[PDB]
Amino acid sequence: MNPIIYTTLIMTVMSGTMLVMISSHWLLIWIGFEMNLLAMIPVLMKNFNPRATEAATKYFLTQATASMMLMMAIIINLLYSGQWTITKMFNPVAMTMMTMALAMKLGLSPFHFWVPEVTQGISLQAGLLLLTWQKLAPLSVLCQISQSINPNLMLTMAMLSILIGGWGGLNQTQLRKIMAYSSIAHMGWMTAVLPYNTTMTILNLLIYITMTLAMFMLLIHSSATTTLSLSHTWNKMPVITSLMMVTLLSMGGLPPLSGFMPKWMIIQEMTKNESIIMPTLMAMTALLNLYFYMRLAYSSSLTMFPSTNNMKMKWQFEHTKQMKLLPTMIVLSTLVLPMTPALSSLN
Amino acid sequence: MNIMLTLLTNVTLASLLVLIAFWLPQLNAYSEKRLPFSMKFFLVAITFLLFDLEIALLLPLPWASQTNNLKTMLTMALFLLILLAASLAYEWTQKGLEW
Amino acid sequence: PLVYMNIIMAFAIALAGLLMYRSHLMSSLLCLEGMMLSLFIMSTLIILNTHFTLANMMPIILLVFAACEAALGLSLLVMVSNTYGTDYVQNLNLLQC
Amino acid sequence: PGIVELPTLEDLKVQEVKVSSSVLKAAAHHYGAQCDKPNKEFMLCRWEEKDPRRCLEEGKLVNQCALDFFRQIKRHCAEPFTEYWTCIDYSGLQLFRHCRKQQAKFDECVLDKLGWVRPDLGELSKVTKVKTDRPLPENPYHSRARPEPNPEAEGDLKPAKHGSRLFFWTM
Amino acid sequence: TMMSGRPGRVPLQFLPNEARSLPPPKLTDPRLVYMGFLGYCSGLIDNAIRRRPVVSAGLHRQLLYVTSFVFFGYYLLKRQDYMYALRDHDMFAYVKSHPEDFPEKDKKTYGEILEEFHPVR
Amino acid sequence: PFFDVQKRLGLDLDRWMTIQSAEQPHKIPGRCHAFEKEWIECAHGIGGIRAEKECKIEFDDFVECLLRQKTMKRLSAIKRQRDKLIKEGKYTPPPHHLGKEDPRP
Amino acid sequence: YIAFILSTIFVIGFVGFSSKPSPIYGGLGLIVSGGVGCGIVLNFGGSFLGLMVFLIYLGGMLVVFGYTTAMATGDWVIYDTGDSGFFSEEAMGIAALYSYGTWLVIVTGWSLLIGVVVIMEITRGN
Amino acid sequence: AGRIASFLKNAWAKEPVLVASFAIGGLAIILPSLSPYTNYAIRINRATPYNYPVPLRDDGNMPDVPSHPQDPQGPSLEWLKNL
C-alpha cells in the first residue's frame, strides 16, 4: 500500500491500544478494541495473496466474536450494577464472560487455534506486530480487573496454554508456527501469575516482547521461514546464526540468560502463596519449549548443513536496509539478569 | 394500538387484493402449456453503508441546537460534516467512484 | 425479568449458531449481526428503564461501530469468494495447526 | 426491615380544585402572580424534605389559595374568563396566540376589578426566596455514619534497610 | 504488595518529589558500570552485524551507546531505590500502627530450651 | 496497564458518563440517584476491600432499587394469596380495586 | 403481557435464522427478528432508538447483506412513576452527544474515516 | 497572486459545483465566529425555562434574590422582547 496509508494504519492500531490503556469507561475500552481490530486487518493483508486473505478472515472472525462477548459482559455488569467504570466486576457470570473474551483475544488455550494459522498466513513483519503489540490491551484490561478473576479458571487456562504450546511446538518445521506456539506458552506463563502479582505479569510481558522482537528481526535479516532455509544462513552470515543461537538459549529459560528472570520470579511469587505443585508442572512443561529451541539451534548454528552453488553470488552483496535497535534487543534479551532487582520500578 | 391497527388494516387489504388478483384468473380453463460479480456494485453498497452510518451520527442535530454550549456543539457538528466530506474526497481521489 | 431473559437467550442462540458453522460464511456474518442486534435491544432496555440520560448515546455508538465491522467482514467475504468462486467455509483450509 | 409509615385517608382529604386544564391555563399567569407565596413555601418544603408525607399541610394551603383565587375570579370576572377559556379549550395545542383579543378583555376586566397586573415575560421563571419558620432538616437523606478513612501514614523517607533484600543482591 | 493504589500518587510521575530526600546512586555504582558494559556490548554487536571491524569501527557510535545506557540506568536506579524505600517505609509504619499483630517474643535462652537430639549412627 | 492520563492532566475524557448521578442534561435525575449517591459517598477513599465489606447496606439498597427483585417477590406473594383466597371464596375486592371508585385530580 | 409475547417471537426468529438455512432465508428471518426487536423498543418508550434500529439496521446493513448475497449464487411493574416534563429524556440524552460526548464524536469519526480507507485498501486487490 | 487568481478562474469554469461547495462550506465555518448574534442565541437558549425554579431559603442576606416574581430583582427579558 501507499506508505502514508501504512503509517496512518499503524498509528491507528497504536492509538486503539492506547485508548484501551488510558480510558476508565467500559464503552471507550470496547471502542479501542474495535479501532485496533479495524486498523489491524489491512496490515496483515499488506502483501496480497490467498494465504494472507485467509489469515485475515480467520483473525477477523475470532476478534469479532471476542468483542461481541466483551460487549455482552459489559452489558450484564451494567444490568446488575449501574456502573461503567472498569473496576471490580460485580457479577460472576459477567466476569466469566469477560475472562473468556479476553482469553480468546489473547489466544490462550482452548482459544489458541487461530494463532498458528494466522501467524503462518501473514508475513514476518505482520507476525512481529501481531505477536508483540497485540497483547498489550487485553493484558492491561486483565491487570485492571485481576482482583475479581476466579483463580481456578485463570489457572486452568494458563496451564492448558503452557501444555498446548509445549506439545504443539514439537511438531513444527515452519518457523512462524514455532513462534506462535512459543507465544501461546509464554501467554500461559504470563496469565498464571495474574491472580497473585500483576507486576510479575508486566515483567514477563516485557522480557517476552524483547526476546520476540530480537528473534523476529533476526529472522527478517536472514530471510528464512523454514528450518531448511534457516540452515543455509551459516554460509552467508555466521554471526547472525550465533546471535540467534544465544537468543534461542535465552528463550528456553536457561540461566544466566534473561529468559530465566520471569519464570524464576513467577515461581517465587507462586511459592509465596502456598502454591507448589503448579510451578513445578510449569517448569517441567517449559522443558518442551526448550527442547524444540535446542533442535532449531542444532539445525542452525551448532552444525553445518549442506549449501547450494548459487549461494556464491549472495556472497558479493550486503544488506541494504539495517534494522535499528536489533543489537539493543539482542543484548536486552540475553544479558539483563544481574539487573533483576530493577523490577521494583513497577515496569 | 392505533398504529398497530393501521398497519394491520394496510397489510390485510394488500394481502386480500393481491390474493384476489392472483386467484380470479385461475378459475377459468386455459391451455396451461451469472459469474461476473462486479466489484463496482459492491463498492457502491459499502459506500452507502458507511455514509449511512455517518448520517446516523448526524441525525440528532435538530435537538443538539438547544444546549447553551452552542460553540462546542457547532464545532462538533462541523467536525462530523468535514470528516464526511473527507471520506467522500478520499473515495473520489483514489478512483473509487468510477464505472 | 422474563423480557431480559429472552433477550439473553436470543444472544446465546445467535452465538451458538455462529459457533456451529455448517457452511456459508455469510451465515456466520448474519449470526454476528444478530448477536449485535440482541445487545442493542438489551442495552437500550436497561438504559431506558433506569433513566440514565447520558447513556442514551451508548446504543447508537455501538450500532455504528458494529455496522462498520460488518462492512469489513463483507469485504473479506467477497475477496474469499473472488479466490474460490464460493463463500464455503471448508475452502479456508490452506493454513492448518 | 422496618414498617413504611403512611398517613390515614383522612389526612388526604381536601376540597379539590375541580376545573379542567383549559381553565387553569387561561388563568395561569394571574394565578402565579397572586398565589405565589403558598406555592413557593410548598415547593421549598417539597425540595428540602424530599418526602411527600412531610408536605401535606402546605398542599392543603395551596389548594385553599387556589380556591380563593378562583372564587374571586368567579365573583368578579365570570363571562370574559368563560370566553377566554372556551377559546383556549377549542385548540388542540391550547395556544395563547390564537385569540389574544379575548385575553385582552379578561386582562382589562381584572385590572378594573382586582387591580391585577399580568406578570411579564421572564418573571414567573425567576428564582425567588421564601421566608419560612420550618426548621431545616439535618439528615434528609437518612444517611448512616461514614466509615473512617485509612490512617494516612506520613513521614520522612529513609533508604531501604540493606537494600532490595532480593535473594543474593547486596544493593 | 501492589502499591498502584497507594494514596497521594501522581499518575504518570517517574520520580516523585519525595524521592529527592534519598541519597542518589554514585556515578561509580557497580550497576551503572554494568549498564555501561551493556551499552558497549550493544555497540560491538552493532559493529558485527553491519560487517565492520568490531573493536574499532565507530568510536562515536560506541560512545553514544555507552552514554545512553548509563543515562537511562542512572534514572532507573533512582526509581528502583525510591520504590524499595517506599516499601520499607510502609512496612515499618504498618508494624507500628498494629502492635497487637506483632508482639514482642519473650526471649528464651538455649540453656532453658529442650531440643530433641538425634544421634547419627 | 491503566495510565491515568485524565487524572494527570485533569481532562475528563470519559468520567462524565460513568455514573447515574453525574450532571445529567437539564438536571434529569436517575431512577436510583439517591441510592447511588449514598453508596458512592460511603465507599469513597476507603478502597475496594473495605468498601465491599463495610458499605454492603448501601450497595444492597442500590441493587434493590435497580432490579426490584424483593419488591416483585412481595407483590407476587400478595397477588398469589389474593388469587387463592378469591378462588376459595372468602375475600372480595373493594369497589376501589374494581373500577367503581371516585377518581381524584 | 404484550412485551412478553414480542420477546417470545424475537427468540423464535433468532432460532429460525440461527439454523442457517439458505442465507437469503436466514436474512429474511433476521429481518423479521429485527422488526420484532424494534417493536419491543418502541413499545418500551424508546421511539428514537427503535426508529434508529428500523432505519439504520434494517434499511442499510441488512439491505447491503441481501445485496451482497444476491450478487452471489411480569412487565409493566418495573416502570417509572412521574413524568419527563416538556421534553423527552431519550432525545435529550441522545442530543447530549454534541455537548457532552466530544471524545466519543472524535473517536467515532476517526474510526469511520479509517473504515472507509481500510475498505478501499482491502478491496483494491492486486 | 497571479497563480491563485488563475486557478480560481480556471476552477470557476468547468468546475462550478465544487467551487460553490467549498465557498459555502468555508463561509459556514468562518462566519459564526464573527457574527455578534451567536451570543444572543446562547442567551435565548439560557432563558428557556424547562425546569421548575426551586426557591431559596431566605436568611436576610440575599438582597439580589427577589421575594416575588414582580419584584425588580433578578434577570430581565426586556432585551429579548426588543429583539
Ligand SMILES: CCCCCCCCCCCCCCCCCC(=O)OC[C@H](COP(=O)([O-])OCC(O)COP(=O)([O-])OC[C@@H](COC(=O)CCCCCCCCCCCCCCCCC)OC(=O)CCCCCCCCCCCCCCCCC)OC(=O)CCCCCCCCCCCCCCCCC
Ligand atoms: C559471566 C560472563 C562474563 C563474560 C561476559 C561474556 C559476554 C561479553 C560480550 C558479549 C557480546 C559483546 C561482544 C561480541 C560481539 C560479536 C562480535 C564477534 O563475533 O567477534 C569478532 C571479533 C574478532 O573478529 P574480527 O576480526 O574483528 O571480525 C570478524 C567478524 O566479526 C566475524 O567473524 P567470522 O564471521 O569470520 O566468524 C564467524 C563466527 C563468529 O561468530 C561469533 O563470534 C558471534 C559471537 C557469539 C554471539 C554473541 C552473543 C551475545 C551476548 C551473549 C553472551 C552469553 C553469555 C552467557 C554465558 C553463556 C556462554 C555461551 O561464527 C562461527 O564461527 C560459528 C560457530 C559458532 C561457535 C559456537 C557459538 C557460541 C557463541 C557463544 C559466545 C558467548 C561468549 C562470547 C564472547 C565474545 C565473543 C566475541 O571479536 C572481538 O575481537 C571483540 C570481542 C570483545 C572485544 C574486547 C576488547 C576490549 C579490551 C580493552 C581492554 C580490556 C578491558 C578491561 C579494562 C581495563 C584495562 C586497563
Ligand SMILES: CCCCCCCCCCCCCCCCC[C@@H](O)O[C@H](CO[C@H](O)CCCCCCCCCCCCCCC)COP(=O)(O)OCC[N+](C)(C)C
Ligand atoms: C529487557 C528489559 C525490559 C526493557 C524495557 C524497554 C527499555 C526502553 C524503555 C525506556 C524507558 C521507558 C519509561 C518511560 C518514561 C517515563 C515513565 C513514567 O511516566 O511512567 C511511570 C512508570 O514507569 C515505568 O513503569 C518504568 C519502566 C522501567 C522498566 C525497567 C524494568 C525492567 C525489569 C528488570 C530488567 C533490567 C532491565 C535494565 C536494562 C534496560 C509511572 O507509571 P504509572 O502510570 O504510575 O503506573 C502504571 C504502571 N503500573 C500499572 C504497572 C503500576
Ligand SMILES: CCCCCCCCCCCCCCCCC[C@@H](O)O[C@H](CO[C@H](O)CCCCCCCCCCCCCCC)COP(=O)(O)OCC[N+](C)(C)C
Ligand atoms: C493535550 C495533548 C494535545 C496533543 C495530543 C493529541 C492526541 C490525539 C488527539 C485527540 C485529543 C482530543 C482533544 C479534545 C478532547 C475533548 C475534550 C475537550 O475538548 O473539551 C471539550 C471542548 O470541546 C472542544 O471544542 C473540542 C474541539 C476539538 C475538536 C477539533 C479537532 C479534533 C481533532 C482530534 C484528532 C482526531 C483526528 C484528526 C483530524 C484532523 C468539552 O467542552 P465543554 O463544553 O467545556 O465540556 C462539556 C461538558 N459540559 C457540557 C458539562 C459543559
Ligand SMILES: CCCCCCCC/C=C\CCCCCCCC(=O)O[C@H](COC(=O)CCCCCCC/C=C/CCCCCCCC)COP(=O)(O)OCCN
Ligand atoms: C475549507 C472548507 C471545507 C469544507 C467544505 C466542504 C464541503 C463539501 C466539499 C467536499 C466534497 C468532496 C470534494 C472532493 C474533491 C475532489 C476533487 C477532484 O478530484 O475533482 C477533479 C476535478 O476538480 C479539480 O480540478 C480539483 C479541485 C478544483 C478546485 C475546486 C475548488 C477549490 C477552491 C475554490 C473556492 C475557494 C473559496 C471560494 C471563495 C469565493 C468567494 C466567496 C477531478 O474530477 P473528475 O471527476 O475526475 O472529472 C475530470 C474530467 N472531466
